[PDB]
Design a protein around this ligand. Structure first.
Ligand SMILES: *C(=O)[C@@H]([C@@H]1N=C(C(=O)O)[C@@H](S[C@@H]2CN[C@H](C(=O)Nc3cccc(C(=O)O)c3)C2)[C@@H]1C)[C@@H](C)O
Length: 265
């Protein structure tokens, strides 16, 4: 029983776990706590890059953005390296997805603009995709720090799965921008030990991870069977029982993804 397996994993990792896979032609929706709120953490960066792509001509990717010391306020593996020269919007989108760069996300929010340093416009973008659940309220690093149960900066496995489905599989973006987003996620470097670990090598996996305080570890992916049948997989978790400094546990997501892949194969 799948629900039983997911419950075994929650006890194993002292965690709360959320899973959603949207229904297809012959597969029923997979859902476990799928309508409970979980912190986005960095998973918001996938629809953020979509919002920025949507909002501008494609060649806005070639605009150079400059920033300095006081702009580096969170984990930023790429932005720290380029602070002296700047980064184009294209580089920022690339860093935000593939390295989960926090500074790149803040600069991309600022590019999108409007109230809340871009957070209101980001939330408005999800609303345009029919997501009436998710909300972004803060930028990096504060967006990962809301206490357990607090609705600020949250989504649900169900809501984010349907957003990602529209972005990658559906028509939310024109084909050229849709390919940009899909390729960045295909080239992600942070996800080898999460959804990717749960699916056999001959399944294609693209993803965007999230990690935060209270032992938060998320992964949202699109996967394709060896015959090109796609599925959207949203896995979210926290270990709030360990307090603010609880260790995020990727293995939980790998195991949950293995359970999902078992059902989809
Ligand atoms: C968003 O969830 C959060 C990001 N997202 C992360 C993720 O999805 O894994 C991590 S960043 C990822 C895991 N940690 C390493 C890291 O710290 N790399 C690194 C390497 C060299 C330099 C630097 C640096 O200068 O900062 C970092 C990569 C993270 C929790 C927030 C912050 O967006």
């Amino acid at each position: 029983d799948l629900a039983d397996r997911f419950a075994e994993l929650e006890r194993r990792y002292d965690a709360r776990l959320g899973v959603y896979v949207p229904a297809t032609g012959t597969t029923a929706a997979i859902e476990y706590r799928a309508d409970e709120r979980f912190a986005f953490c960095s998973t918001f960066k996938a629809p953020l890059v979509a919002a920025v792509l949507h909002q501008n001509p494609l060649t806005h990717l070639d605009k150079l953005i400059t920033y300095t010391s006081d702009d580096i306020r969170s984990i930023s593996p790429v932005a720290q390296q380029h602070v002296q020269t700047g980064m184009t919007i294209g580089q920022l989108c690339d860093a935000a997805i593939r390295y989960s760069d926090g500074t790149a996300a803040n600069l991309l929010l600022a590019d999108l603009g409007g109230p809340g340093g871009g957070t209101a416009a980001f939330t408005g973008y999800l609303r345009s995709l029919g997501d009436t659940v998710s909300r972004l309220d803060a930028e990096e690093p504060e967006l990962n720090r809301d206490p357990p149960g607090d609705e600020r900066d949250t989504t649900t496995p169900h809501a984010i799965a349907l957003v990602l489905q529209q972005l990658v599989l559906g028509n939310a973006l024109p084909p050229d921008k849709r390919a940009l987003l899909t390729d960045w996620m295909a080239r992600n470097t942070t996800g080898a030990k999460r959804i990717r670990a749960g699916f056999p090598a001959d399944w294609k996996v693209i993803d965007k991870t999230g990690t935060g305080d209270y032992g938060r570890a998320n992964d949202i992916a699109v996967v394709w069977s060896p015959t090109g049948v796609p599925y959207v997989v949203a896995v979210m978790s926290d270990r709030a029982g360990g307090g603010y400094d609880a260790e995020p546990r990727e293995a939980l997501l790998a195991e949950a993804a293995t359970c999902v892949a078992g059902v989809l194969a």
